[PDB]
């Protein structure tokens, strides 16, 4: 199962660009489909969601009134129509899939880059580091409306790759995520714990929840860059 975005490229400010998200296989389950974007060198920003039947849509405040999400279930395509494009919309655009109302993105496309030419917040520590074998913790603090009212998920983004689900529903691990990774949630905060730190763990880590009067909008944490130091932690 592979999601494939297309339609990216260079576009003039004020123009309209339509992105598409296709799937390598069809599913018997019902999937809400999302768009998530990431400006070069910046964090993930949730953009929009469409319900399985197209009845319900939600948008981030930064794109409301300009972007339209739609889907063609017969052709098995999801669209993001980006109108009135601004320089600030320059980003890699991912389409992501959520089964029903689970609240976590199981599948991500590779993303498509959009360059526009002009010529509440989940707080995370910006940087974390440790030596091999050590245990590192990464906090994510929100409010009663987001973390205090929803499951918290965690996503890992290795350099030059699409984000991947790491922890869902506060503390559950997908198949293929070792028990070294563990999540917890208490009140308005959550934390990701990485024990037995390894070189492969060097990546960006994002917490994620939902917000709004009915938690209809997605929200990603500010992001934490984890560095696995090429150093010992003995005294000497
Ligand atoms: C999330 N999704 C892609 C998906 C779903 N709905 C869409 N809906 C629209 N309108 N457009 C798409 N791009 C689209 N893509 C999936 C998810 C899982 C499976 C999948 O695991 N299929 C298994 C069978 C198990 C299953 O049905 O889930 C297989 O072997 O083919 C396929 C597609």
Numbering used by the authors: 2 to 120, 143 to 259
Question: What did the original publication write about this model?
Answer:
Comparison of the scFv with the original VHH-MTX scaffold, upon which the conditional scFv is based, revealed that the MTX binding pocket is largely maintained, conserving the key interactions of MTX with CDRH1 and FW3 without being perturbed by the diversification of CDRH3 and addition of the light chain. While not directly engaged in the binding of MTX, CDRH2 makes contributions to the stability of the MTX binding pocket formed by the framework and CDRH1. In particular, the carbonyl groups of S52 and Y53 orient the side chains of FW3 residues R72 and N74 to form hydrogen bonds with the pterin moiety of MTX. As expected, binding of MTX to the scFv resulted in a conformational change of the paratope: in the absence of MTX, W32 is oriented outwards and faces the light chain, while upon MTX binding it rotates inwards to make contact with MTX within the IgV core creating additional space for significant movement of CDRH3 as demonstrated by a 7.1 Å (C-α to C-α) shift of D102.
In this specific case, we selected MTX, an FDA-approved drug, and CD33, a well-studied and validated antigen for AML therapies, to highlight the application of the conditional antibody technology to CAR T cells.
